[PDB]
């Protein structure tokens, strides 16, 4: 199911966090990975293996995982951080299964 | 007192467990998902 | 249930079991049947006058103390229980 | 790398659809293609996956008997065959190369390159 807040609010310069929750079979056992999706384009990888960050994403973004929940901290929030953020988590119920979160519409107050 | 709950769980986890009987001894068949990482051949 | 049912079955079998006594201690001899699945004969060394062989050495006997009726299925127990039973003192 | 996919399709309910993306920039066999749906009004939904090196698929529970993800190693192009269309199957179907990293302490998987590619019914 990977429930996460339907949307989030933030004004520039304030650290804000997106959080996702799931059972022990998907986020408890495996590693989450967050996917940004700027409006009007296709989603692109943001965070993989819950900490690491691909070549291109600023240190501005970070990920974390506590037990059965994962959190995406967007520090130094800027205007171009307005998008939908999804989290995926390979689940062990079947031999191949992932679960995408509902998505979180992050706006930039102002 | 975060340690109290951890120790309680660890002590209670093994109450009545018979380690001579595989899980699902008569109900199911134990599926074991194996995996190997060969550090050096 | 089934799992517990068997748990009490095995516990009852092992409670009051004297490992020091062979099957039918006061009675007729116990008959042990043996198999060998020779997995490999590795090295036949003429200098050491020896050879090496890996095998699956199996024995089978009757232990009326280890009899149960309340389940039909063939029981397979964790090897650590072989310490609590009587096993023949075979040696090569 | 990059995953160039097919153009938009329009079909009426019940007509099987065809969507394909040719993998360019890497050994198409090493990594396994995964398909993802994204309804315009809602978030992403995992369609299924399949390893090209074998051909074994892992379709989601909710498309167990409707999807056929085959592949062609020669052209390095992988495609699905969604059938029994309804009004609710309108969405943009992305194909995502699933990268993986295995080591001492288990697996960690992610969808690296992604693509594009719409469909309406
Ligand atoms: C316990 O193990 C014995 C030995 O393998 C099983 O005996 C076999 O049972 C099948 C029928 O289910 C026969 O066709 C075989 O000929 C039997 N073999 C021998 C050597 O007796 C037995 O089925 C297992 N379970 C029970 C409840 O006895």
CA distances from D6 to B15, D12, D67, D93, D94 (A): 59, 19, 17, 10, 10
Distance from CA of B33 to the nearest CA of D (A): 12
Residue corresponding to tokens 């065959």:
D81
Ligand 1 atom closest to the Cα of residue C74 is 1
First to last CA, chain C: 44
Token pair for C14: 């092992």
Backbone angles phi, psi at D88, to 5 degrees: -90, 5
Q: How was this structure determined?
A: cryo-EM
Residues of B in Cβ contact (< 8 Å) with D103: 37
Residue C2 burial (CB count, 10 A): 12
Alpha carbons D61 and C73: distance in angstroms, whole number? 35
> Nearest Cα to D90, choosing from D23, D19, D33, D4?
D19
Spell A61-81 as b/e; 16+ CB within 10 A means b.
Answer: bbbebeebebbbebeebeeeb
Whole-number Å distance, alpha carbon A51 to ligand 1 midpoint, is 55
Ligand 1 atom closest to the Cα of residue C73 is 27
Token pair for C19: 């490992």
Residue D107 burial (CB count, 10 A): 14
CB B25 to CB C3 under 8 A? Answer: yes
Distance from CA of B1 to the nearest CA of D (A): 30
Contact call for residues A70 and A32 (beta carbons, < 8 A): yes
Whole-number Å distance, alpha carbon A33 to ligand 1 midpoint, is 52
Instruction: Kindly state the DSSP code that residue A48 receives in the 8-state scheme.
Output: S
Instruction: Kindly state the DSSP code that residue A25 receives in the 8-state scheme.
Output: I
Alpha carbons D49 and A28: distance in angstroms, whole number? 22
Strand order of the β-sheet with A44-47 is A7-8, A104-106, A83-88, A33-37, A44-47
Q: Whose CA is nearest to atom 5 of ligand 1?
A: C74
Token pair for D13: 């309910």
Q: Whose CA is nearest to atom 12 of ligand 1?
A: C73
Whole-number Å distance, alpha carbon B38 to ligand 1 midpoint, is 40
Chain B and chain C share a number of CB contacts under 8 A equal to: 29
Distant-in-sequence, close-in-space partners of D2: CB < 8 Å, separation ≥ 6 = D24, D25, D113
Q: Give D96's strand partners.
A: D34
Spell A1-21 as b/e; 16+ CB within 10 A means b.
Answer: ebebbeebebeeeeeeebbbe
Token pair for C42: 């590795």
Instruction: Kindly state the DSSP code that residue C65 receives in the 8-state scheme.
Output: G
Instruction: Kindly state the DSSP code that residue B27 receives in the 8-state scheme.
Output: T
Backbone angles phi, psi at C44, to 5 degrees: -105, 100
Q: Among A88, A101, A103, whose Cβ lies nearest the Cβ of D111?
A: A88
Backbone angles phi, psi at C4, to 5 degrees: -60, -55
Tell me which chain C residue has its CA closest to the CA of residue B23: C3
Cα Rg for chain C, rounded, in angstroms?
18
Q: Whose CA is nearest to atom 3 of ligand 1?
A: C74
Distance from CA of B40 to the nearest CA of D (A): 12
Alpha carbons C77 and C87: distance in angstroms, whole number? 15
Resolution in Å equals 3.0
Token pair for A85: 């953020």
Residues in chain A: 110
Residues in chain B: 41
> Nearest Cα to D55, choosing from D73, D35, D81?
D73
Chains near C (3 or more Cβ pairs under 8 Å): B
């Amino acid at each position: 199911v990977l429930t996460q807040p339907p949307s989030a609010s933030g004004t520039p310069g304030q650290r804000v966090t997106i959080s996702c929750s799931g059972s022990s079979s998907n986020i408890g056992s495996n590693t989450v990975s967050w996917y940004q999706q700027l409006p009007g384009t296709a989603p692109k990888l943001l965070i993989y293996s819950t900490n690491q960050r691909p070549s291109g994403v600023p240190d501005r973004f970070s990920g974390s995982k506590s037990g059965t929940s994962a959190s995406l901290a967007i520090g130094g929030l800027q205007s171009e951080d307005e998008a939908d953020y999804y989290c995926a988590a390979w689940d062990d119920s079947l031999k191949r299964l992932v679960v995408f979160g509902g998505g979180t519409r992050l706006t930039v107050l102002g | 007192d975060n340690t109290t709950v951890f120790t309680r769980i660890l002590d209670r986890l093994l109450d009545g467990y018979d380690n001579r009987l595989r899980p699902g001894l008569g109900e199911r068949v134990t599926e074991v998902k194996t995996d190997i990482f060969v550090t050096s051949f | 249930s089934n799992m517990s049912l068997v748990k009490e079955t095995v516990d009852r079998l092992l409670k009051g079991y004297d490992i020091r006594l062979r099957p039918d201690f006061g009675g007729p001899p116990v008959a042990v049947g043996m198999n060998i699945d020779i997995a490999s004969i590795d090295m036949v060394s003429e200098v050491n006058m020896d050879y090496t062989l890996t095998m699956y050495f199996q024995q089978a006997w009757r232990d009326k103390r280890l009899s149960y009726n309340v389940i039909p299925l063939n029981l397979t127990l964790d090897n650590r229980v072989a310490d609590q039973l009587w096993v023949p003192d075979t040696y090569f | 790398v990059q995953l160039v996919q097919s153009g938009a399709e329009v079909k009426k309910p019940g007509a099987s659809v065809k969507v394909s993306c040719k993998a360019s920039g890497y050994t198409f066999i090493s990594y396994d293609i995964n398909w993802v749906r994204q309804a315009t009004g809602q978030g992403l939904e995992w369609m299924g996956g399949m390893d090209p090196k074998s051909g074994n698929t892992g379709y989601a529970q909710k498309f167990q008997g409707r999807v056929t993800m085959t592949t062609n190693t020669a052209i390095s192009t992988a495609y699905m065959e969604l059938s029994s269309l309804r009004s609710e199957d309108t969405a943009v179907y992305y194909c995502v190369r699933g990268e993986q990293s295995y080591d001492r302490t288990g697996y960690s998987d992610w969808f690296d390159p992604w693509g594009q590619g719409t469909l309406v019914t």
